[PDB]
Design a protein around this nucleic acid. Structure first.
Ligand SMILES: Nc1ncnc2c1ncn2[C@@H]1O[C@H](COP(=O)(O)CP(=O)(O)OP(=O)(O)O)[C@@H](O)[C@H]1O
Length: 435
RNA sequence: GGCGCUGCGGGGUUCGAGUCCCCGUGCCACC
């Protein structure tokens, strides 16, 4: 249908209604009256300040501007005192900051330096006010275009730079809209993005570079898309193409996970002929920004072990539930032989040859292309037993918190027992199951 | 604090680690 009509109806799923605005407006006005009675310098930044927040994800952010005379730690806890005061519910989160609510509305209170211009950028937090200031006037009249882009990305699991997502940050979306002027223009052009595209908003041009790079108008040296993974960039370009090819309101609706019977899943695994198994361990008590990168690390390490040991892994995946974490793996080798070849020294190296042949072995060493070789015995013949051996000895390298939890307890789950665990969605995804 | 790319060292696997495995500036961090 008329693309213009799809986007008009898309505003509904994306723009917050009057009931949610006044909720926030009555929180904004009441938050200021409290901040003024104390007599502290503050500024309302963020997506709320620019009226670009997505429907459902309301959050009023306030930044406490302090003079740079009191440097170092001489202003951190001085802001925590003001936080709890104007807030109804204090609960510090981790550089510190205070999270809370004001008349039901979610709020953030953050301390940072006032600074001159964005040349004194040492602390990374001291950048948001400059970002806000750069966007405050340029985004005016395009708020809905920003909201459309966000909902589009949100509905396809690529909104937010947080490590659980590794997608497009809100700031990035606003810059993209300021650059192309609208959501529709962003999608049309994204179709021709490459892994080497450089979007320079301030200079108003597009170049070719070393990697995908969105120049921050505040700092030319920094990539606003720094944490946008290569695979999500790819997913987006493919999405934009699909959208223009055959527009649909569905691109703005979340996808329900693939519901599937454990028996069908077992029969699928049987047909693939692969080894499918999970590492299950207790979830560390840490925030998502720490957990997911560790889960990626543990996943990667084990996946590399599998390659080294010639179990030929296909893909990996991980899920975090309420109490446990799962590291999932699929491998082309269910079983490998006990014997393998170990490489001995060159034949003319008399000293080393003697040491190599001094070891006791079941079978005789042999010469091949000038070198000595010997048959020896693996310490495991299936990837499950391999990973069990590895997770026991190399727990330390599987992430700080993750690795420590694995050291205390883990278990390898495979077969039909695995299909009972809450990982069906992930197993379906990594195997590319469809229905 | 966690992860990532480098640099300098100490161990492990091995007949033999400049190389393989482990150990002692950037990103997300409310940027
Ligand atoms: N990765 C980043 N790079 C540069 N600036 C960022 C940034 N992340 C956040 N900011 C700044 O901090 C402000 C608020 O950050 P957040 O509240 O965490 C996301 P948001 O801008 O509120 O989007 P949202 O309300 O639609 O979810 C942003 O408006 C932006 O100015």
């Amino acid at each position: 249908m008329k693309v213009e009509e799809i986007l008009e109806k898309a505003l509904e799923l994306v723009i917050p209604d009057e009931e949610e605005v006044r909720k926030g407006r009555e929180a904004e006005e009441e938050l200021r009256r409290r901040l003024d009675e104390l007599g502290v310098e503050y500024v309302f930044v963020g997506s709320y300040a620019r009226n670009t927040w997505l429907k459902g994800s309301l959050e009023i952010d306030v930044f406490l501007l302090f003079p740079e005379e009191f440097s170092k730690e001489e202003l951190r806890e001085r802001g925590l005192e003001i936080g709890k005061a104007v807030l109804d519910s204090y609960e510090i989160r981790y550089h510190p900051y205070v999270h809370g609510v004001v008349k039901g509305v979610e709020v953030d209170v953050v301390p940072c330096y006032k600074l001159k211009e964005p040349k004194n950028i040492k602390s990374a937090v001291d950048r948001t006010p400059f970002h806000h200031k750069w966007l405050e006037g340029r985004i005016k009249g395009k708020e809905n275009e920003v909201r459309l882009l966000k909902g589009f990305l949100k509905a396809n699991g690529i909104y937010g730079a947080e490590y659980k997502v590794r997608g497009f940050s809100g700031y990035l979306c606003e810059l993209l809209i300021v650059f192309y002027g609208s959501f529709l223009e962003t999608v049309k052009n994204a179709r021709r993005w490459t892994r080497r595209t450089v979007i320079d908003v301030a200079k108003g041009e597009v170049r070719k570079g070393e990697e995908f790079f969105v120049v921050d108008p505040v700092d030319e040296k920094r990539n606003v898309a720094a944490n946008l993974s290569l695979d999500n960039l790819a997913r987006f370009v493919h999405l934009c193409r699909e959208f223009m090819e055959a527009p649909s309101l569905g691109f703005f609706k979340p996808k329900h996970p693939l519901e599937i019977e454990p028996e069908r899943l077992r029969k699928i695994v049987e047909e693939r002929g692969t080894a499918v198994f999970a590492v299950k361990f207790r979830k560390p008590d840490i925030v998502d920004d720490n957990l997911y990168p560790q889960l990626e690390r543990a996943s990667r390490k084990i996946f590399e072990f599998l390659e080294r040991e010639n179990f030929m892994p296909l893909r990996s995946a991980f899920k975090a539930s309420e109490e446990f974490c799962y590291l999932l793996f699929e491998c082309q080798i269910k079983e490998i032989s006990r014997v393998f070849r170990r490489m001995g020294p060159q034949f003319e190296d008399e000293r080393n040859v003697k040491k190599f042949l001094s070891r006791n072995r079941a079978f005789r060493p042999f010469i091949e292309n000038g070198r000595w070789w010997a048959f020896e015995m693996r310490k495991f013949t299936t990837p499950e037993e391999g990973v069990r051996s590895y997770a026991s000895t190399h727990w330390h390298t599987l992430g700080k918190n993750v690795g420590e939890s694995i050291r205390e307890y883990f278990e390898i789950i495979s077969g039909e027992k695995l299909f009972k665990e809450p990982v069906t969605a992930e197993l379906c995804e990594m195997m590319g199951v469809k229905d």
